[PDB]
Design a protein around this nucleic acid. Structure first.
Ligand SMILES: [Mg+2]
Ligand SMILES: [Mg+2]
Ligand SMILES: [Mg+2]
Ligand SMILES: [Mg+2]
Ligand SMILES: [Mg+2]
Ligand SMILES: [Mg+2]
Ligand SMILES: [Mg+2]
Ligand SMILES: [Mg+2]
Ligand SMILES: [Mg+2]
Ligand SMILES: [Mg+2]
Ligand SMILES: [Mg+2]
Lengths: 62, 86, 97, 63, 190, 139, 139, 143, 55
RNA sequence: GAGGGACAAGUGGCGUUCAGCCACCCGAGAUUGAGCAAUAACAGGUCUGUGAUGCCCUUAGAUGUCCGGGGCUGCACGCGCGCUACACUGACUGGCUCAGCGUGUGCCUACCCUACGCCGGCAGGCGCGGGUAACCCGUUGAACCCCAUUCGUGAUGGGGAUCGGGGAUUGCAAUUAUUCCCCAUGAACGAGGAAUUCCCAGUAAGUGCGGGUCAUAAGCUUGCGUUGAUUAAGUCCCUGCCCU
């Protein structure tokens, strides 16, 4: 059960019934340059380092 | 008449707990004997931990300050800051 | 000896002030400044309606009373000489010796 | 914020159509040129027309 | 030419031991200042709130609930007492344990709703580090307030106890209690 | 430094029970003694205010009760007292715990004998100075 | 050789007359050490605790304030001192040192030389404040 | 050197000024203030027994500050907040009897001079007294 | 001899203007009524009625 | 008083040549708050605004106007806007220290604003003075805040509702309404269930002052100041509206 870290490359847009999360394709620092898309609620910019708790996730909403 | 309220929250800390108005003999003796063992001489810790009121706690702290055992660091309105040297 | 120009409209105030200074420069009198008094304002708040329907919506009427003072020390003959001036009715003239 | 009125853009297009050699890239000169060549009562409208004239100059001189 | 300091402090060698909270805590030399009561005009821009010092943020979140709504002199006085209480409790510098409390006093991911207009599931998604700092300061000041509610202990005393029990992994503070309350739901809806 | 004095609970005027927090705030527990009158009686009795209620001489307690039962011998002019001129005697005096309820019952009894509307609204479950009773005064 | 620089807080104005001398800060006849809040006896000392002591010993400044609030007067004194040093280093000392000390003051804080365009808004005729409204009533 | 009451901290100044007024006995207190007098419009009486000397010292400081005040002027100088219970508060003034009392007492002890266009102002004797008391308070602070 | 404030004399003069103007548009509704102009002069108080039909 | 000054201008990216967004700097300001506000509807409210008015009733034992009382306040109850608290970030006492709008007289029909001295504890009285006003109240010495003491988790000294006695002031008249001051009696109230109101920066909230009716007179309202947050700067899920 690893705990990974991830800094933001690009920000796609805000998502939700309220528009409260944000689909963020973040990037992987501890591994090679792989690409997953995460939901990060709250304010976020390009370059925000973020603690991940599971790396086998999924882009949630279309 | 009748009593009406929209909440039910009973069971507080201790049942209208008594507290020492004036210092006793053995209690104040225990205060003076184990008070150098503490690190922060604050009136709230001295009051709640050792079954003292705030008035008698501040009175004993000023008495020991006049004795000169505990050095005052920065006294203020509600945060009395006392510390034992070494 | 001072003269107070108490005015309702600031444009006619400045016009009669420019006319008075233009008529007072050529004479051998030490003309003092037209001292700018602070503008008086009588604010009145009104219900907007005879019967109380709707939101608490209030009229806010104002005025802007302006006032200027000049100091022209002179004898009363020179004061009565300066006094005869045709003026716009938005300005009132008072003298004080 | 700069989603200015059709009459503002129309006045700026009339200025850039009639007088082109009188204008440049400096706002502080183009404003005085527009006040020599036109009559605008409102100073905010002066600044807005002259700013869009400078934007039209930066667009035309580039492409 | 002297070094910047709160009281009789130094404000040096106080470092964030990890990443994901860097450049949002203003502990460093480029954002040091004497008092928290500064020219706080940090609400116009969206992201200028991050340049605020966290001691000023703790004062601003401490002043709450109507009867204590305002009074920056009072809450800067409370934090000034609280740093001194933390220092007299076994050294262990108050700015350093405040940074440690912001690191380990709350969320890492939180539960919220997604679309589809269906079952209310409250799925746990990741939370921004800015909002982590915000909710950490909120949990710390709320725990200090309702721990010092109706006792002889002061606001500075219970705030110092809250910061010490939040920096040390002892799970005796309200910030760690609501931290657990969030990550149990996060493990449930993971 | 007053280690221990054997005094916790006193008996004043057959009904009142003195407290233990302060002397000036345990005389407050007597019905008929409020906020300022206790400090006035303390300043007339010349007792140190830092001392408790259970640290005080019984002769000085008798002196305090003497000042209670007759304040007008020494000082404390007529305005500070509770029972002012309308007595049917004109007696400027301070009420007792047993005496105050008796004087109130005499007030209400003569209001019932006059059948004044103030006494009538007190005889009913109403308010004398409660000018609005739509929402105010329920149950 | 005397420069008068002014204030400009929200409703607080500090006239600071600065002149070459031996070291003085006069706040309405009351010196630097007597700051009216005890908590803010580090924020007004920032031209002293950060810039130096020979600058203080070189320039005498007297400050008279007709402000409106306590915090407003403290920041008015702070801004008046931090602008009075800049204006005296315009009028008498060279720009090669003026620009350096001004860059030090600006990189510490913008409000040491830039005034704050913040005034309170007008109370609206519908609500109790400037943005808020009163409570509605539905069913 | 140069010592002024503006230069000296006040809560060290007035706390010794009450004692140096008790040393000289510069107080008159006829009957009602011998008995009891409360605050402005308040509940309780002031605690520490030298409060008349404290009022006289604050009167002396304020007449050093503003020359020309009087009874109602110093009453509004003191002032206060009047909590009315359920009904919200306002600004209540002080009392006039203590104001005229302290003014008459310090005039009889030669510390208040009447202004022919105004009211109280400083005497040179009271000026020397307050300046030397500020000097010895500042000396006790720097010692 | 008698005097009032500047804050009240102007509103009294304005009430005089409205009183005279609206009473003349009451009673002079026959001819064409446009408005009035009043010049404040301490020698002769001049009131000028601007009318469409001056007959 | 006039004029200047800010226009998204300058740079880089995002965008079709675009229209325009984002970060920085110079700058006081990268834009504050109000007024006015269309075409056209509601069969919204006002005849209790009038010497604005159509129709119906009355006009002498009046549905006209006065005079003397009572009444709108009246209570087993439910609802709304608000104020005070449920305390120790606090209550009490003393000291210290800062404002901004604006109001005020012999009125185009009845009238103030208040300094100074003395008396009284206070509410107040007496004599005298200034102001038709940047002049006099007034360098509006405000509250909050700051410093020191007391209180010490107790429905306690928080809360002051109810209630008795007395003393002052307006008014011709205050008791089943004035108002203010002193003493005393000292309740519920332990942070409020279902639901619901307002709010994006000098903003909410704490806190005092000024005008309106006023003689007595604010817990309402309109404006002004002091301290001054948290968190968004996004969306069509709830609600309402608009367009196609
Ligand atoms: Mg209505
Ligand atoms: Mg009553
Ligand atoms: Mg009803
Ligand atoms: Mg329309
Ligand atoms: Mg007719
Ligand atoms: Mg009828
Ligand atoms: Mg209500
Ligand atoms: Mg009248
Ligand atoms: Mg009764
Ligand atoms: Mg009310
Ligand atoms: Mg709604």
């Amino acid at each position: 059960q690893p705990i990974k870290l991830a800094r933001v490359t690009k920000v796609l847009g805000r998502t939700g019934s309220q528009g409260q999360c944000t689909q963020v394709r973040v990037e992987f620092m501890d591994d090679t340059s792989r690409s997953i898309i995460r939901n990060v609620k709250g304010p976020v910019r390009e370059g925000d380092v973020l603690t991940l708790l599971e790396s086998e996730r999924e882009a949630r909403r279309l | 008449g009748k009593a009406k309220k929209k909440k039910w929250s009973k069971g507080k800390v201790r049942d209208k707990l008594n507290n020492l108005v004036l210092f006793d003999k053995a209690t104040y003796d225990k205060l003076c004997k184990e008070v150098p063992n503490y690190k922060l001489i604050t009136p709230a810790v001295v009051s709640e931990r050792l079954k003292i009121r705030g008035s008698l706690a501040r009175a004993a702290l000023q008495e020991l300050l006049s004795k000169g055992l505990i050095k005052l660091v920065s006294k203020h309105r509600a945060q009395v800051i006392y510390t034992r040297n070494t | 000896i001072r003269i107070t120009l108490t005015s309702r409209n600031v444009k006619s105030l400045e016009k009669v002030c420019a006319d008075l200074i233009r008529g007072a420069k050529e004479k051998n009198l030490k003309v003092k400044g037209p001292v700018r008094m602070p503008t008086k304002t009588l604010r009145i708040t009104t219900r907007k309606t005879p019967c109380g329907e709707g939101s608490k919506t209030w009229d806010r009427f104002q005025m802007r009373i302006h006032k200027r003072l000049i100091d022209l020390h002179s004898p009363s003959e020179i004061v009565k000489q300066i006094t005869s001036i045709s003026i716009e009715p938005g300005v009132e003239v008072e003298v004080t010796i | 914020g700069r989603v200015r009125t059709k009459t503002v853009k129309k006045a700026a297009r009339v200025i850039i159509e009639k007088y082109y050699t009188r204008l440049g890239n400096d706002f502080h000169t183009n404003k005085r040129v527009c006040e020599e060549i036109a009559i605008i009562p409102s100073k905010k409208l002066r600044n807005k027309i002259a700013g869009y004239v400078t934007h039209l100059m930066k667009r035309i001189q580039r492409g | 030419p002297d070094i910047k300091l709160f009281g009789k402090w130094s404000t040096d060698d106080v470092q964030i031991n990890d990443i994901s909270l860097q450049d949002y805590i203003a502990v460093k030399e480029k954002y040091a200042k004497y008092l928290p009561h500064s020219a706080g005009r940090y609400a116009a821009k969206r992201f200028r709130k991050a340049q605020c010092p966290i001691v000023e943020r703790l004062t601003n979140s401490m002043m709450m609930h109507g009867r204590n709504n305002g009074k920056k002199l009072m809450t800067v006085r409370i934090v000034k007492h609280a740093f001194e209480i933390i220092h007299l409790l076994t050294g262990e510098n108050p700015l350093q344990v405040l940074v440690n409390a912001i690191i380990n006093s709350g969320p890492r991911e939180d539960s919220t709703r997604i679309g589809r207009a269906g079952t209310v599931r409250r799925q746990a998604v990741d939370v921004s580090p800015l909002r982590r700092v915000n909710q950490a300061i909120w949990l710390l000041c709320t725990g200090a307030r309702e721990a010092a509610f109706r006792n002889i202990k002061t606001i500075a005393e219970c705030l110092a106890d809250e910061l010490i029990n939040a920096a040390k992994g002892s799970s005796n503070s309200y910030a760690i209690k609501k931290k657990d309350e969030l990550e149990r739901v996060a493990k449930s809806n993971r | 430094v007053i280690p221990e004095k054997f005094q916790h609970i006193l008996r004043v005027l057959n009904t009142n029970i003195d407290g233990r927090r302060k002397i000036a705030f345990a005389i407050t527990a007597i019905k008929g003694v409020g906020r300022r009158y206790a400090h006035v009686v303390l300043r007339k009795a010349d007792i140190d205010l830092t001392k408790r209620a259970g640290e005080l001489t019984e002769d000085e307690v008798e002196r305090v009760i003497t000042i209670m039962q007759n304040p007008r011998q020494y000082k404390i002019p007529d305005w500070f007292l509770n029972r002012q001129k309308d007595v049917k005697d004109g007696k400027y005096s301070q009420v007792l715990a047993n005496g105050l309820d008796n004087k109130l019952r005499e007030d209400l009894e003569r209001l019932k004998k006059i059948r004044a509307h103030r006494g009538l609204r007190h005889f009913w479950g109403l308010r004398v100075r409660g000018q609005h009773t739509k929402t105010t005064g329920r149950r | 050789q005397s420069v008068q620089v002014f204030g400009r807080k929200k409703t607080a104005t500090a006239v600071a007359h600065c002149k070459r001398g031996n070291g003085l800060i006069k706040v309405n006849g009351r010196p630097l050490e007597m700051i009216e809040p005890r908590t803010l006896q580090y924020k007004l000392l920032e031209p002293v605790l950060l810039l130096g002591k020979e600058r203080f010993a070189g320039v005498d400044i007297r400050v008279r304030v007709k402000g409106g609030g306590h915090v407003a007067q403290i920041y008015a004194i702070r801004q008046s001192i931090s602008k009075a040093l800049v204006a005296y280093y315009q009028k008498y000392v060279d720009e090669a040192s003026k620009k350096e000390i001004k860059d030090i003051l600006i990189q510490y804080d913008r409000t040491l030389l830039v005034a704050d365009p913040r005034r309170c808004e007008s109370k609206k005729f519908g609500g109790p404040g400037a943005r808020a409204r009163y409570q509605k009533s539905y069913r | 050197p140069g010592v002024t009451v503006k230069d000296v901290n006040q809560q060290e100044f007035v706390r010794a000024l009450a004692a140096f007024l008790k040393k000289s006995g510069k107080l008159k207190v006829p009957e009602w203030v011998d008995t009891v007098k409360l605050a402005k419009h308040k509940e309780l009486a002031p605690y520490d027994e030298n409060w008349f000397y404290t009022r006289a010292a604050s009167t002396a400081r304020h007449l050093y500050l503003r020359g020309g005040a009087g009874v109602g002027s110093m009453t509004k100088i003191y002032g206060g907040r009047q909590r009315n219970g359920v009904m919200p508060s306002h600004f209540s003034r002080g009392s006039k009897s203590v104001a005229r009392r302290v003014l008459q007492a310090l005039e009889g002890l030669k510390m208040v001079e009447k202004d022919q266009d105004g009211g109280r102002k400083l005497t040179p004797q009271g000026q020397r007294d307050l300046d030397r008391i500020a000097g010895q308070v500042a000396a006790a602070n720097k010692k | 001899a008698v005097q009032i404030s500047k804050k009240r004399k102007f509103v009294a003069d304005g009430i005089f203007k409205a009183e005279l103007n609206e009473f003349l548009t009451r009673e002079l509704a026959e001819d064409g009524y446009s408005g009035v102009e009043v010049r404040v002069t301490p020698t002769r108080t001049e009131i000028i009625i601007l009318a469409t039909r001056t007959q």
